[PDB]
Design an enzyme around this catalytic site. Structure first.
Site, short mmCIF file in Angstrom:
data_model
loop_
_atom_site.label_atom_id
_atom_site.label_comp_id
_atom_site.label_asym_id
_atom_site.label_seq_id
_atom_site.Cartn_x
_atom_site.Cartn_y
_atom_site.Cartn_z
CG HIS A 1 22.35 37.84 20.93
ND1 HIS A 1 21.42 37.62 21.92
CD2 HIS A 1 22.13 39.10 20.48
CE1 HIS A 1 20.66 38.69 22.06
NE2 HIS A 1 21.07 39.60 21.19
CE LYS B 1 -4.07 1.81 2.47
NZ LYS B 1 -4.89 1.76 3.72
C1 LIG Z 1 21.44 47.21 13.27
C2 LIG Z 1 22.38 46.26 14.03
C3 LIG Z 1 22.04 44.91 14.11
C4 LIG Z 1 22.86 43.97 14.81
N1 LIG Z 1 22.46 42.64 14.88
C5 LIG Z 1 23.27 41.74 15.61
C6 LIG Z 1 22.86 40.37 15.70
O1 LIG Z 1 21.83 39.90 15.16
N2 LIG Z 1 23.69 39.54 16.45
C7 LIG Z 1 24.85 39.97 17.08
O2 LIG Z 1 25.50 39.10 17.74
N3 LIG Z 1 25.27 41.28 16.98
C8 LIG Z 1 24.49 42.12 16.27
N4 LIG Z 1 24.90 43.50 16.17
C9 LIG Z 1 26.16 43.91 16.83
C10 LIG Z 1 26.07 44.05 18.34
O3 LIG Z 1 25.06 45.03 18.65
C11 LIG Z 1 27.43 44.44 18.90
O4 LIG Z 1 28.35 43.43 18.54
C12 LIG Z 1 27.34 44.54 20.41
O5 LIG Z 1 26.40 45.58 20.75
C13 LIG Z 1 28.64 44.89 21.00
O6 LIG Z 1 28.46 44.87 22.41
P1 LIG Z 1 29.42 45.68 23.33
O7 LIG Z 1 29.01 45.41 24.70
O8 LIG Z 1 30.83 45.36 22.90
O9 LIG Z 1 29.19 47.21 22.97
P2 LIG Z 1 27.91 48.14 22.71
O10 LIG Z 1 26.64 47.36 22.80
O11 LIG Z 1 28.20 48.92 21.47
O12 LIG Z 1 27.92 49.07 23.99
C14 LIG Z 1 28.96 50.00 24.35
C15 LIG Z 1 28.34 50.93 25.41
O13 LIG Z 1 29.44 51.60 26.07
C16 LIG Z 1 29.06 52.95 26.32
N5 LIG Z 1 30.30 53.71 26.41
C17 LIG Z 1 31.21 53.95 25.41
N6 LIG Z 1 32.24 54.67 25.80
C18 LIG Z 1 32.01 54.92 27.15
C19 LIG Z 1 32.73 55.64 28.15
N7 LIG Z 1 33.90 56.24 27.89
N8 LIG Z 1 32.22 55.70 29.40
C20 LIG Z 1 31.01 55.08 29.66
N9 LIG Z 1 30.26 54.38 28.79
C21 LIG Z 1 30.81 54.34 27.52
C22 LIG Z 1 28.13 53.31 25.19
O14 LIG Z 1 27.29 54.42 25.50
C23 LIG Z 1 27.42 52.03 24.87
O15 LIG Z 1 26.13 51.97 25.41
C24 LIG Z 1 24.08 44.44 15.45
C25 LIG Z 1 24.39 45.79 15.35
C26 LIG Z 1 23.57 46.73 14.66
C27 LIG Z 1 24.01 48.17 14.63
C1 LIG Z 2 -1.15 11.43 12.10
C2 LIG Z 2 0.26 10.93 12.45
C3 LIG Z 2 1.26 11.90 12.63
C4 LIG Z 2 2.60 11.54 12.95
N1 LIG Z 2 3.55 12.54 13.10
C5 LIG Z 2 4.88 12.16 13.40
C6 LIG Z 2 5.89 13.17 13.50
O1 LIG Z 2 5.70 14.42 13.35
N2 LIG Z 2 7.18 12.71 13.79
C7 LIG Z 2 7.49 11.38 13.97
O2 LIG Z 2 8.70 11.12 14.23
N3 LIG Z 2 6.54 10.41 13.86
C8 LIG Z 2 5.28 10.80 13.57
N4 LIG Z 2 4.27 9.77 13.43
C9 LIG Z 2 4.69 8.35 13.61
C10 LIG Z 2 5.44 7.74 12.44
O3 LIG Z 2 4.66 7.94 11.24
C11 LIG Z 2 5.69 6.26 12.71
O4 LIG Z 2 6.46 6.17 13.90
C12 LIG Z 2 6.48 5.63 11.57
O5 LIG Z 2 5.70 5.72 10.36
C13 LIG Z 2 6.74 4.19 11.83
O6 LIG Z 2 7.53 3.71 10.74
P1 LIG Z 2 7.59 2.18 10.41
O7 LIG Z 2 8.53 2.02 9.31
O8 LIG Z 2 7.84 1.45 11.71
O9 LIG Z 2 6.15 1.75 9.96
P2 LIG Z 2 5.04 2.37 9.01
O10 LIG Z 2 5.48 3.67 8.46
O11 LIG Z 2 3.76 2.28 9.78
O12 LIG Z 2 5.04 1.37 7.79
C14 LIG Z 2 4.69 -0.02 7.86
C15 LIG Z 2 4.47 -0.44 6.40
O13 LIG Z 2 4.48 -1.89 6.40
C16 LIG Z 2 3.55 -2.33 5.43
N5 LIG Z 2 3.23 -3.70 5.78
C17 LIG Z 2 2.60 -4.17 6.91
N6 LIG Z 2 2.46 -5.48 6.94
C18 LIG Z 2 3.04 -5.90 5.76
C19 LIG Z 2 3.23 -7.19 5.18
N7 LIG Z 2 2.80 -8.31 5.79
N8 LIG Z 2 3.85 -7.28 3.98
C20 LIG Z 2 4.29 -6.12 3.36
N9 LIG Z 2 4.16 -4.87 3.82
C21 LIG Z 2 3.52 -4.81 5.05
C22 LIG Z 2 2.42 -1.33 5.51
O14 LIG Z 2 1.55 -1.37 4.38
C23 LIG Z 2 3.13 -0.02 5.77
O15 LIG Z 2 3.28 0.78 4.63
C24 LIG Z 2 2.93 10.13 13.11
C25 LIG Z 2 1.92 9.19 12.92
C26 LIG Z 2 0.58 9.54 12.59
C27 LIG Z 2 -0.42 8.43 12.40
#
Ligand SMILES: Cc1cc2nc3c(=O)[nH]c(=O)nc-3n(C[C@H](O)[C@H](O)[C@H](O)COP(=O)(O)OP(=O)(O)OC[C@H]3O[C@@H](n4cnc5c(N)ncnc54)[C@H](O)[C@@H]3O)c2cc1C
Ligand SMILES: Cc1cc2nc3c(=O)[nH]c(=O)nc-3n(C[C@H](O)[C@H](O)[C@H](O)COP(=O)(O)OP(=O)(O)OC[C@H]3O[C@@H](n4cnc5c(N)ncnc54)[C@H](O)[C@@H]3O)c2cc1C
EC number: 1.8.1.4
Lengths: 464, 464
Positions: free
Chosen positions: B443, B35
């Protein structure tokens, strides 16, 4: 005047975390911040942007994929609300910082700090006052500032991430300088909201730091989104005429004039190293104007450490926190563990599809001399990817033929930025592809793409 | 007169994957299926249901957070279209199975298999024919079937996951018997599409196989959705009245009637073990009427293996695949690795928010005399969670105090099903909380929640 075991300069991700770790280790700590509690990240970077990114994504789905999901009806999106929500999320996160400071008995000092002596800090309170603060150890987490295109300046129409992320209204068009994470992210958001977006990159590829395959793919998605990206193009000048902006660019000798109502400067970020007596404390810089530092975040001066972007190692939030912990611990003499090769640290761009990666790129591993081995699995062959409605992207892993040690990971797909944990954990604690291939991944999930790569790395992939 | 080194019964996840691994190991392989190619999972389980959960998710996002995202307008979701997509996604996966059968030179036998000897299989070809096939080894992967409520029977309005997931039209109301993953997942979909859903659970907790904390949380989410869940309630009988189904149930020693247009039966699944001469092969069953097997999926009969739901160890798709590999590998005599305590294997419920877990629950780890250590972290304290617009849920980790070894992981939140990898890898390869706490996480991601738990496990968290 007042004295503390440890004093941190800056309350950004690195500063407030290092402060917390210091407090957790029984060290008298105080933190000096004048404006952004939570740094750029919480206030005007990581946090707020990720919020807008999500809004942009929904605009995408309920638009381009509306029919595919059996959705009918006229719908519209107000960026204003997106803006407001992003500010709310940030506001909430900032409140959290102040809570954490209070909870760990960390003293807050609201003002600007300047090193007067190697162990003295002059602070300019925000209330106008001024107090001196002595310390046995100091942690500099002053972060960094955006670097403008040489010769240009900021104006009403030429802004930085900061002024743009705080705009509740959007321009009819815009030109972004820099195809880095920040540049790509704004492009994604703005475009999804009807803004004509053009992104200019000096290097030959978008997200140049990424692996060439990743750059190529993400460029396909953006072109498909309607964003115009110009590579190998150099920005010459930016002239803000009031009614519009003219950015002169050059490519292979030919120069043209691009015009838009606004231009975002995002080519890079330069550490904040001047204006607070770094010279009076003795702390030296690098040839790149970044604070020199060792594997323990220690500077040329013993009791002074530099964490976060200020050291320019890997300007990313998680890195700043990680270094903060390493800083605090080493100060307290408690158990610590250097981060090591900062290239092994994870990173991700949060546009859709996501771009996540770590370690070396394929080419990089090769030039490095490793016995490169690569496995690439497309998400078009992943069940979850199809179920969520985003079968694009792929997972490319790089390892060394010797024992199958991971060298790097480069992914692109639906929220793939959550799939990195297993990879880094393995690389850090030496778990070869063989061990990774024996780890069972839940079905159906994006993570399975990693499992298949583990198999393709060791022997043969199953579902492919 | 056809003979094969290995013969596989059933083409479900474990089956066809077993056949694939066998072929890769240079084993003459044949697979018998009448199946579902790809089994229940790809035809009417995993695959199709996950796609439907994605459509329901989008309906939930809009109807509830439309304004929160600044979405203005009135839209309508056509379940008929959602249904059509689920079939396309499914047929795609199925078609892929055949591709892998051909690619690996695996012989497809379309018909029902029945044992006659320990090395002979009688096949009832779907074309009416009747042939026999011998083998040196056999892999039984016959899956399971829906266990009906004692005394009840299927009918036009009383169905199982199969008829339900295959219906394009939705009922005005429905009563789901069983609050397990499948039952909960259907509730979510149907409810989001306007159906009045009522779920009846014998045990005093929804998702009783999960951790109590997870059950409580998921119960609160479903209540807000509008789903009525009756726990600690026993279904006595189901009367299909044609225009209405009547479900007599008992809660608090008092019987009462529940009525609806349809009723879904999903209280459990029993391994398929009769009707195909298992006794002819001399394969023994456990006291739970499941095929007994050792850590190598080996039955009491040396050359006969059983994988998948048929052995009832952990009825999930990834489990079946993982067992298939161990089986095929053992037969071929290649280096392998037993899965170990199946309780440590990951599982997940794909409703929103998701439910992901592995290992022992807090109470279980205690009952087994472990020096239990727990660390919980809420997503309201997670940056990414707010950005996505769903800070609900948490990450609960349970470890042993001896060396900080993980015993169990229980999460609930936005697509947390993707966060298990790192946890199972560490538990599988003796990595403790201490090594896990030194792994930096990108982060801002949901995975940062794990990182906090790791810290609060080794000592103190940071952002809480
Ligand atoms: C738009 C944007 C998106 C970003 N996205 C990510 C991301 O997704 N992931 C990621 O990991 N990084 C990201 N970054 C980078 C991240 O923000 C910097 O790497 C991180 O802020 C650096 O941390 P920090 O503590 O070194 O300094 P900062 O966070 O720059 O802080 C320094 C602080 O020290 C203070 N300061 C400075 N001089 C003095 C002083 N003389 N006396 C007292 N206080 C002072 C400031 O006022 C400031 O608040 C992003 C940056 C921007 C601009
Ligand atoms: C609605 C639903 C949602 C699920 N969601 C998840 C999920 O998100 N994550 C997850 O990890 N698991 C999920 N599961 C479970 C997962 O589908 C089962 O754990 C997995 O299919 C088991 O695999 P299997 O190979 O042991 O058997 P099955 O996939 O059940 O296959 C057995 C096969 O053997 C065949 N068979 C049986 N007897 C014979 C025979 N005598 N001769 C020849 N062929 C035969 C059948 O026809 C069938 O196709 C879900 C199950 C259901 C019902």
């Amino acid at each position: 005047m007042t004295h503390y075991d440890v004093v941190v300069l800056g309350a950004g991700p690195g500063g407030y975390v290092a402060a917390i770790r210091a407090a957790q280790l029984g060290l008298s700590t105080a933190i000096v911040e004048p404006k952004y509690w939570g740094g750029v990240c919480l206030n005007v970077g990581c946090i707020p942007s990720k919020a807008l990114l999500r809004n942009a994504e929904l605009v995408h789905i309920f638009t381009k994929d509306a029919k595919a999901f059996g959705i009918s009806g006229e719908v519209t999106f107000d960026y204003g609300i997106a803006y407001d929500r992003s500010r709310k999320v940030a506001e909430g996160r900032v409140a959290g910082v102040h809570f954490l400071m209070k909870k760990n008995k960390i003293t807050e000092i609201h003002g600007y700090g300047t090193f007067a002596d190697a162990n003295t800090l002059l602070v300019d309170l925000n209330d106008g006052g001024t107090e001196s603060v002595t310390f046995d150890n100091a942690i500099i987490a002053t972060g960094s500032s955006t670097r403008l295109v040489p010769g240009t300046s900021l104006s009403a129409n030429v802004v930085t991430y900061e002024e743009q992320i705080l705009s509740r209204e959007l321009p009819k068009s815009i030109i972004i300088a820099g195809a880095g994470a920040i540049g790509m992210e704004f492009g994604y958001v703005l475009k999804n909201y009807g803004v004509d977006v053009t992104i200019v990159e000096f290097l030959p590829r978008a997200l140049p730091n990424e692996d060439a395959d990743v750059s190529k793919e993400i460029e396909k998605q953006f072109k498909k989104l309607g964003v115009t990206i110009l590579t190998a193009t150099k920005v010459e000048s930016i002239a803000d005429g009031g009614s519009q902006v003219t950015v002169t660019v050059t490519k292979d000798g030919v120069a043209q004039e691009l015009k838009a109502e606004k231009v975002l400067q995002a080519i890079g970020f330069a550490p904040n190293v001047e204006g607070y007596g770094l010279d009076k404390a003795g702390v030296a810089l690098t040839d790149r104007k970044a604070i020199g530092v060792d594997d323990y975040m220690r500077t040329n001066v013993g009791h002074i450490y530099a964490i976060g972007d200020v050291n320019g190692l890997l300007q990313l939030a998680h890195v700043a926190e990680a270094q903060g912990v390493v800083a605090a611990e080493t100060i307290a003499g408690a158990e610590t563990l250097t981060l090591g090769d900062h290239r092994m640290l994870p990173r991700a761009t949060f546009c859709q599809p996501n771009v996540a990666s770590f370690g070396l790129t394929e080419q990089q591993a090769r030039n490095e001399g490793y016995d490169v081995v690569v496995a690439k699995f497309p998400f078009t062959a992943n069940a979850k990817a199809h179920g969520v409605g985003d079968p694009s992207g792929f997972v490319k892993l790089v390892a060394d033929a010797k024992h199958g040690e991971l060298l790097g990971g480069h992914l692109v797909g639906h929220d793939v930025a959550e799939l990195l944990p297993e990879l880094t954990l393995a690389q850090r604690w030496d778990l070869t592809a063989s061990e990774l291939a024996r780890n069972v991944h839940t079905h159906p999930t994006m993570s399975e793409a990693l499992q298949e790569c583990f198999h393709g790395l060791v022997g043969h992939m199953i579902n492919f």
